[PDB]
């Protein structure tokens, strides 16, 4: 099916009508999304089938057709853009300055933007347009809003 680079919606027809469960990135012939979006299941692109290739529930990442290709990293200083693809709505860039998730294994960037759960897998970009991570895995704060980590994989 379609293997052109870009951002894609992950849809299902199992529930009522057509429902958007997430988003993903196509780069170098590899589809990249969050593990909780697909649960490692196969995907369809027109008449073609995309089989999982690599995945990890702890990182909450999965790649299809080949190994993880995205290796750009947040520089710890600059603003970034979330390329939000909300259910039933057009792709939209939103610029923000990331906060920090401080963990026992190191710091990670975090974006404080709230979108439907079906927006999980939407890429976060640097000023060169490079994908520095995916949106959709984080935490709920005092008022009930979400703060997502900038989740990035490792390019072997």
């Amino acid at each position: 099916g379609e293997t052109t680079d870009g951002v894609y919606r992950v849809m299902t027809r199992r529930l009522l009508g057509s429902t958007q469960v997430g988003v993903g990135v196509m780069q170098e012939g590899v589809f990249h999304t969050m593990w909780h979006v697909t649960k490692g299941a196969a995907l369809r692109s027109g008449e073609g089938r995309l089989d999982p290739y690599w995945g990890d529930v702890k990182q909450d990442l999965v790649s299809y057709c080949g190994p993880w290709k995205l290796d750009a990293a947040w520089d710890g200083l600059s603003e970034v853009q979330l390329l939000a693809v909300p259910p039933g709505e057009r792709a939209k860039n939103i610029q923000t300055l990331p906060g920090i998730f401080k963990t026992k294994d190191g710091d990670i960037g975090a974006v404080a933007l709230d979108y439907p759960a079906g927006t999980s897998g939407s890429p976060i970009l640097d000023k060169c347009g490079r994908v520095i991570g995916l949106y959709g895995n984080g935490v709920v704060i005092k008022n009930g809003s979400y703060v997502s980590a900038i989740t990035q994989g490792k390019r072997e």
Binding site: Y8, M11, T12, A42, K58, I100, V111, V139
Partner: protein
Amino acid sequence: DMYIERAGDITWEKDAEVTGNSPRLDVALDESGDFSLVE
């Protein structure tokens, strides 16, 4: 059964809507990939 649909090009947009704060939070990540706040 899941399927994918193209939604756009991956590019930076000059003069996009600029919003959102930058919180510094203490978090923990468990074996199931779930984050939680440590207080």
